[PDB]
RNA sequence: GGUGAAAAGAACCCCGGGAGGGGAGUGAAAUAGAGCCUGAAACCGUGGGCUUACAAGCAGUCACGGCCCCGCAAGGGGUUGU
RNA sequence: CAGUGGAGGCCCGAACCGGUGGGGGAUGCAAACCCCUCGGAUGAGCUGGGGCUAGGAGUGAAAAGCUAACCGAGCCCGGAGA
RNA sequence: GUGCAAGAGCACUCAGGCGCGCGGGAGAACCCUCGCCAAGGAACUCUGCAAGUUGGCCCCGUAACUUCGGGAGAAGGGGUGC
RNA sequence: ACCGGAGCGCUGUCUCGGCGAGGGACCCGGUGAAAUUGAACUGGCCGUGAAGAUGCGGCCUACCCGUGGCAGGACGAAAAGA
RNA sequence: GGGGAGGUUUGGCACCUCGAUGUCGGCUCGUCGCAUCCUGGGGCUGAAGAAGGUCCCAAGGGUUGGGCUGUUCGCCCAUUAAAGCGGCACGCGAGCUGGGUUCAGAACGUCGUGAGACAGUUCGGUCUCUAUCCGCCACGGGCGCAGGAGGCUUGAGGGGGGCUCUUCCUAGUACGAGAGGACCGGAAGGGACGCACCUCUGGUUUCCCAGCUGUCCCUCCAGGGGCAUAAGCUGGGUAGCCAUGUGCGGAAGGGAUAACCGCUGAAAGCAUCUAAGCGGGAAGCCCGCCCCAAGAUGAGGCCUCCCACGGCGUCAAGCCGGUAAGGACCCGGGAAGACUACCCGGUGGAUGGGCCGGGGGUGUAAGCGCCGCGAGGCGUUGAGCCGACCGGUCCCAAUCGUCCGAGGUCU
């Protein structure tokens, strides 16, 4: 309400464009030794277990 | 390192007990004024009827400082209290016998005047 | 003109013949000329010179190539030095004389998003009377309609040091070749590990 | 920046002191603890030190170990059966493990402080 | 270059052994390598360390003394060329390892303040009149 | 304020904790399914066509060219490079 | 003169009443707040409950202050589509 | 409740009650709140604004002026633990 | 707790800043506003124009899109200028 | 007495702006003009020398601290090489202040019968967390760069820096009656400023060590913990970050010029620095030093590594997948850092944590023995505790693994 405040709607056009690096990035998985499920790189993971 | 409004204790007999420096006489803008160097001053207390009174405006230099002072040779100096002795437009000292002691620097700067009457040139 | 290249070790003082004097230690290892470029094959002279030991392994790169078109044992760093074509193969701190003087380049610390203050050494604000929002600000930064803009390079706050940075004319001390040690006159950008190259100044 | 020093720690002195304390308290009462990965790194070493300390025998030893711990019984119990099992593996008394699991609602990684068997 | 240490000691062969252990609190005199107008000299120092600061080599310690009136203090780097003979006098109970609250209270204070430490004064002159009775015969 | 002619208001199965969907079923019609006729506009979104990372702009207009689209061609539609 | 005595719009200081100076806050925790600091603190003291006085009117140690979060004349209808 | 000259003050703590209904990290500038600093000691500034200094009790001791009550906690100093 | 002048004490007020602590700022997960808003594809200089131009002329510069930060412009917002 | 330039003063006009363009000073940050205060160059002098006068050339840089006032200005103290003057909305209040002035309160003088009034005075008196765009400082993601990849580079273009004094040697020589006192060339020290650094000096160092009060607790004694801040207080402190501390910079040098000095030299037999021509000459211009830098789309160079087609479009431009060199993810982490980026490492490994050693800090743990009624003291002891620094050691932790990435158009 004071000071700093928008000149002008800003068009839909820059705004979307603002939003471009605003995308997400799938996770990272791997195939463990013990079941084919899919763990995320250096950890343990529940209905597959470990060792040492 | 002394500065404008700095109160200096006077080394020698001039009559002088303390004066506050005025200007720190150097460069056209020096900053501080350390053992050897030359400042004007005013007299901000003196024994009765000295040689020098009260609010005369002095010539005076720095004989022993708070701020240690290095030598060139690794070793430094410190001394308990900030002191100078009145001198001279001629550049010698208007008093004579000046207890206390002094730094060496005072001889790199031909103030051996000072340093003979000097009891401890340390 | 002499150059080689090497990493700051530390600094402490030594004394000269009587009187103490602050030095920073640097270490120049064997540098081994990898390509000598010649203004026929390039367009100016200069020497390739490396720096630390590799281990093969990490090497797998074409610079195995490069390594094996010269014939030297991989180095880690490797970096030129303009109009300087020595002999043999290899520069020693042998190349320094104690009394000559030398410029040191560097890479200073890293202080990052610094303050303007901290950056431009500039005076910010009154601590007591004035309002406590504007401390160690800039304060100011232009007029009004006219030009009504900021001038470009106007000192503000911002990413500073961790930059190449050159001290010169810094006097080489004792040299000792028994373990490739160079002492030079104390200041000397760069943190203790940082690779720096060490030039002939320029006196005259 | 100044970050040229050890290590790095949340909330202010006191309290992230009584934190290590209070977690090695439960980590040595029941030698898997899971925590979020920053906590756990850092409690991590603190153990170790309580350990390799118990390691030792001396009054002094236990006495000095028993300013972060309180509890004299769990004291015993380092001096007794936990600090004997870890004889002749100088270091590396505990291990840290990357859980796949992040807590819902702050997202946090978790992570496990497992007593090295 | 898994040595950035002694590297550095290595430079470090400026060392001297010829200099007294003296641990702060207990008085001591150093003859300086002062340079008089252009020649050399040995200016005493006799009076109190009050600061010892360690760092491998360039450890530097300081020693403070009134002087007619007025309080001085020195700082000698301890590997120093230039002091010839560092000499112990006393030795007193330290309590402390930096000590300047003696600025504070320069006096008869100061002297009940800092005891004698008899344990090495025992050690000090027992060890000297009897190694000297073994390097005798 | 307004389902439908009628509640016929969606049994039963499937996913789901539920909400909500997907089949099945009613109905002429269910993008008439329950604040449910019609359902415009701003506004948000998915798919496709033309187009854009050496460029200067009240955003259009006039011209030529290229790509896609209706027609056999002549023609016309869309888009925008200069 | 000493003793006893225990006066005061007396002193220091919490509660309680208040708002000096500064900093914070300024789409606030908050349509007047917070922190530090500061005045009074047996009196022309503070406070609960029950009562009375109001619009050219009331109250007012007097600022045109206060009279239901804006008072040089309250608020709500109405003359009124002045 | 204990301690501090006393106390409803301050510190810690019973009984009782609570951790203030977003968290997890990182350890930039800058802002708030807070701690320390060589030498100097008002040079800052419209102003010592702010901050720092001093601080309780016990003893010594205390000026002009006075409406004889004051000024006075004048000032300045010493003691304080076990 | 009125307004002025001075001095002693003591001080980050200052010479002249420095480092440190904590709550924000910053990154990730949950929730998620506001004033403002002709439309915008919104650069510099020197002209110029209703006399202080991103938008006219001439020239110069300039790959597309963000994040942290600063306030010089948008005659910035706010209040139909007291 | 006459002609003009500038647009800093006072003012004239009333042209944009009254559905708002915040006013004087100060602070912060500056930047530009030259009509130059200093430093550099030079002409004339009623210029002996030194010092100075007036005029010319020249912004590169520099242009102090304080007393008085709200002041700008000015006066004054002390110094300086000098303490220049202007523009930028009398630059800068979405940067700060709010002392001045222009709200309400109050008062003096003054005027008015009065209410009130006064560029007359005096005390008091709310300066608004969030930046959308341009601009600016920084840092990334995308694509491009006629094959893909690793390392190293050139430098168009741009930026930074650019100050100055004092003493000494020449020589007490030239000049001068004396007092004074040089040119030119050379040496040393210093002021402010800038960049970098932690040896040293000096800071901080939030739990590294020690002491101390009150209280509550473990466990009665000893010993120890919590709280007194967000360290209860106090004494002291590594690394890191720092200035008060250390180093180093301004050049030298080459080239072209300014005012100005001059050679040869007509026009115009002489004369002239010029009309052809040539030489000298600035703290200034170009370059040289230092930093950025090939989005220099005009996308540059070098060195090295990988290299055919396996299936559709009939020439031509393309598309889908497995790959190569090589790259990314993921992890341990860093004097790198807001984020991202950057750099090192990932078991063929010392990257982090622990542990050992060293450095460092603190300054003689606890327990026991001994002396004293006791508080305590002495011994075992430089003990104990012990962050960050320099190393070492696979005890723990960087497991395992995945994805991407050309097949190189035409004359
Ligand atoms: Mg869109
Ligand atoms: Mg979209
Ligand atoms: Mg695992
Ligand atoms: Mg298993
Ligand atoms: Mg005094
Ligand atoms: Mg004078
Ligand atoms: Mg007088
Ligand atoms: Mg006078
Ligand atoms: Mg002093
Ligand atoms: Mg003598
Ligand atoms: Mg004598
Ligand atoms: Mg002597
Ligand atoms: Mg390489
Ligand atoms: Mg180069
Ligand atoms: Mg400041
Ligand atoms: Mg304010
Ligand atoms: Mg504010
Ligand atoms: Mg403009
Ligand atoms: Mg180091
Ligand atoms: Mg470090
Ligand atoms: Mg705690
Ligand atoms: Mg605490
Ligand atoms: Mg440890
Ligand atoms: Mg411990
Ligand atoms: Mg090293
Ligand atoms: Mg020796
Ligand atoms: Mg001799
Ligand atoms: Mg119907
Ligand atoms: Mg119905
Ligand atoms: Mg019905
Ligand atoms: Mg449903
Ligand atoms: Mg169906
Ligand atoms: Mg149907
Ligand atoms: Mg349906
Ligand atoms: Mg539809
Ligand atoms: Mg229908
Ligand atoms: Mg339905
Ligand atoms: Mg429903
Ligand atoms: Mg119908
Ligand atoms: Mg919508
Ligand atoms: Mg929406
Ligand atoms: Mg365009
Ligand atoms: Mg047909
Ligand atoms: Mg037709
Ligand atoms: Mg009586
Ligand atoms: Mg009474
Ligand atoms: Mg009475
Ligand atoms: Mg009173
Ligand atoms: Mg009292
Ligand atoms: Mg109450
Ligand atoms: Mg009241
Ligand atoms: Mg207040
Ligand atoms: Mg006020
Ligand atoms: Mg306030
Ligand atoms: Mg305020
Ligand atoms: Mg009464
Ligand atoms: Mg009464
Ligand atoms: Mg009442
Ligand atoms: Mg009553
Ligand atoms: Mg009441
Ligand atoms: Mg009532
Ligand atoms: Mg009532
Ligand atoms: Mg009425
Ligand atoms: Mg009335
Ligand atoms: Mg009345
Ligand atoms: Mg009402
Ligand atoms: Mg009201
Ligand atoms: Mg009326
Ligand atoms: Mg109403
Ligand atoms: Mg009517
Ligand atoms: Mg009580
Ligand atoms: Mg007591
Ligand atoms: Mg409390
Ligand atoms: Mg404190
Ligand atoms: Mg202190
Ligand atoms: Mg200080
Ligand atoms: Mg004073
Ligand atoms: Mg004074
Ligand atoms: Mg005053
Ligand atoms: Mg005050
Ligand atoms: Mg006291
Ligand atoms: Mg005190
Ligand atoms: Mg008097
Ligand atoms: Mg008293
Ligand atoms: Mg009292
Ligand atoms: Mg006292
Ligand atoms: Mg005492
Ligand atoms: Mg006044
Ligand atoms: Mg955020
Ligand atoms: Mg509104
Ligand atoms: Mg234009
Ligand atoms: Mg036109
Ligand atoms: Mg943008
Ligand atoms: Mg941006
Ligand atoms: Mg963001
Ligand atoms: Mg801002
Ligand atoms: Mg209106
Ligand atoms: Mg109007
Ligand atoms: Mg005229
Ligand atoms: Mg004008
Ligand atoms: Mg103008
Ligand atoms: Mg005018
Ligand atoms: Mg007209
Ligand atoms: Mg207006
Ligand atoms: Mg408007
Ligand atoms: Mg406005
Ligand atoms: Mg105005
Ligand atoms: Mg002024
Ligand atoms: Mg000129
Ligand atoms: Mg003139
Ligand atoms: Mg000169
Ligand atoms: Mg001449
Ligand atoms: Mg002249
Ligand atoms: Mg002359
Ligand atoms: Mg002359
Ligand atoms: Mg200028
Ligand atoms: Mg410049
Ligand atoms: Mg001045
Ligand atoms: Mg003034
Ligand atoms: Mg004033
Ligand atoms: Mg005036
Ligand atoms: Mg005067
Ligand atoms: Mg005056
Ligand atoms: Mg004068
Ligand atoms: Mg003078
Ligand atoms: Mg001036
Ligand atoms: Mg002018
Ligand atoms: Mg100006
Ligand atoms: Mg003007
Ligand atoms: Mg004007
Ligand atoms: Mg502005
Ligand atoms: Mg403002
Ligand atoms: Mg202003
Ligand atoms: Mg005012
Ligand atoms: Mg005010
Ligand atoms: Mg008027
Ligand atoms: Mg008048
Ligand atoms: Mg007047
Ligand atoms: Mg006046
Ligand atoms: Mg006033
Ligand atoms: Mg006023
Ligand atoms: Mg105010
Ligand atoms: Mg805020
Ligand atoms: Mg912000
Ligand atoms: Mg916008
Ligand atoms: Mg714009
Ligand atoms: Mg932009
Ligand atoms: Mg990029
Ligand atoms: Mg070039
Ligand atoms: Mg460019
Ligand atoms: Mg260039
Ligand atoms: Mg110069
Ligand atoms: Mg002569
Ligand atoms: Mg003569
Ligand atoms: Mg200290
Ligand atoms: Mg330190
Ligand atoms: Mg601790
Ligand atoms: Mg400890
Ligand atoms: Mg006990
Ligand atoms: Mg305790
Ligand atoms: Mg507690
Ligand atoms: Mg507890
Ligand atoms: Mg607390
Ligand atoms: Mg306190
Ligand atoms: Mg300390
Ligand atoms: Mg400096
Ligand atoms: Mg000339
Ligand atoms: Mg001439
Ligand atoms: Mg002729
Ligand atoms: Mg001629
Ligand atoms: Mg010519
Ligand atoms: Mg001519
Ligand atoms: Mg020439
Ligand atoms: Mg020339
Ligand atoms: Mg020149
Ligand atoms: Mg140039
Ligand atoms: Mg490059
Ligand atoms: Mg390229
Ligand atoms: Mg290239
Ligand atoms: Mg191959
Ligand atoms: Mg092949
Ligand atoms: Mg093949
Ligand atoms: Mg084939
Ligand atoms: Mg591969
Ligand atoms: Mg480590
Ligand atoms: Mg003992
Ligand atoms: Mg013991
Ligand atoms: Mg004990
Ligand atoms: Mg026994
Ligand atoms: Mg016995
Ligand atoms: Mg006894
Ligand atoms: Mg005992
Ligand atoms: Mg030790
Ligand atoms: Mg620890
Ligand atoms: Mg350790
Ligand atoms: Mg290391
Ligand atoms: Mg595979
Ligand atoms: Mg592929
Ligand atoms: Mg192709
Ligand atoms: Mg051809």
């Known amino acids: 309400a004071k000071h700093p405040v928008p000149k002008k709607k800003t068009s839909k056009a820059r705004r979307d464009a603002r939003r471009s690096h605003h995308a997400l990035t799938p996770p990272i998985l791997v195939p463990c030794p013990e079941c084919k499920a899919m763990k995320p790189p250096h950890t343990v993971c529940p209905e597959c277990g470990y060792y040492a | 390192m002394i500065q404008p409004q700095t109160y200096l204790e006077v080394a020698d007999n001039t009559g002088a007990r303390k004066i506050m420096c005025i200007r720190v006489l150097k460069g056209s803008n020096a900053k501080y004024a350390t053992v050897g160097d030359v400042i004007v001053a005013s007299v901000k207390e003196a024994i009765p009827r000295g040689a020098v009174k009260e609010g005369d405006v002095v010539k005076a230099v720095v004989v022993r400082t708070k701020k240690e002072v290095k030598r060139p040779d690794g070793s430094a100096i410190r001394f308990d209290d900030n002191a100078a002795v009145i001198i001279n437009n001629q550049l010698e000292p208007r008093g004579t016998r000046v207890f206390g002691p002094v730094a060496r620097e005072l001889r790199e700067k031909g103030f051996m005047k000072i340093v003979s009457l000097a009891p401890e040139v340390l | 003109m002499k150059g080689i290249l090497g990493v700051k070790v530390g600094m402490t003082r030594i004394f000269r013949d009587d009187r103490a004097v602050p ?113 160690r600000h800039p304060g100011s930064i232009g007029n009004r309609k006219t030009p009504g803009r900021v001038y470009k390079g106007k000192k503000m706050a911002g990413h500073y040091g961790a930059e190449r940075v050159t001290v010169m004319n810094l006097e080489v001390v004792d040299v000792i070749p028994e373990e490739n040690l160079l002492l030079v006159k104390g200041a000397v950008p760069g943190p203790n590990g940082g690779l720096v190259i060490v030039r002939e100044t320029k006196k005259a | 920046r100044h970050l040229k020093s050890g290590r790095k720690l949340n909330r202010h002195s006191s309290h992230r002191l009584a934190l290590y304390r209070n977690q090695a308290k439960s980590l040595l009462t029941h030698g898997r603890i899971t925590t979020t990965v920053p906590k756990a790194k850092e409690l991590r070493g603190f153990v170790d030190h309580l350990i390799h300390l118990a390691k030792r025998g001396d009054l002094h030893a236990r006495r000095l170990v028993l300013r972060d711990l309180q509890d004299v019984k769990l004291v015993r119990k380092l001096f007794d059966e936990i600090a004997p099992r870890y004889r002749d593996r100088q270091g590396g008394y505990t291990r840290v493990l990357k859980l796949a699991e992040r807590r819902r609602g702050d997202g946090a990684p978790l992570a496990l402080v497992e007593l090295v068997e | 270059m898994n040595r950035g240490a002694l590297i550095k000691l290595v430079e470090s062969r400026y060392v001297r052994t010829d200099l007294p252990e003296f641990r702060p609190g207990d008085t001591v005199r150093v003859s300086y390598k002062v340079k008089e107008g252009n020649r050399t000299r040995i200016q005493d120092f006799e009076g109190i360390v009050i600061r010892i600061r360690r760092n491998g080599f360039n450890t530097t310690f300081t020693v403070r003394k009134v002087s007619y009136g007025v309080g001085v203090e020195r700082i000698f780097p301890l590997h120093s060329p230039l002091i010839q003979k560092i000499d112990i006098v006393q030795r007193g109970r330290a309590r402390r390892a930096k000590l300047y609250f003696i600025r504070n209270l320069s006096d008869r204070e100061i002297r009940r303040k800092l005891r004698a430490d008899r344990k090495r004064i025992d050690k000090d002159r027992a060890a000297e009149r009897a190694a000297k009775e073994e390097v005798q015969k």
């Open chain 3, 23 to 135: 030095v920073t230690v640097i270490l120049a290892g064997p540098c081994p000329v990898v390509q000598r470029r010649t203004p026929e094959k390039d367009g100016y002279t200069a020497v390739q010179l490396g720096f630390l030991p590799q281990n093969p392994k990490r090497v797998n790169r074409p610079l195995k190539g490069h390594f094996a078109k010269a014939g030297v044992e991989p180095v880690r760093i490797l970096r030129e030095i303009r109009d300087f074509n020595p002999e043999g193969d290899t520069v020693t701190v042998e190349i320094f004389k104690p009394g000559e003087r030398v410029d040191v380049t560097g890479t200073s610390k890293g202080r990052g998003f610094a303050g303007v203050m901290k950056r431009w050494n500039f005076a910010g604000g009154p601590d007591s009377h004035g309002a406590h929002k504007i401390h």
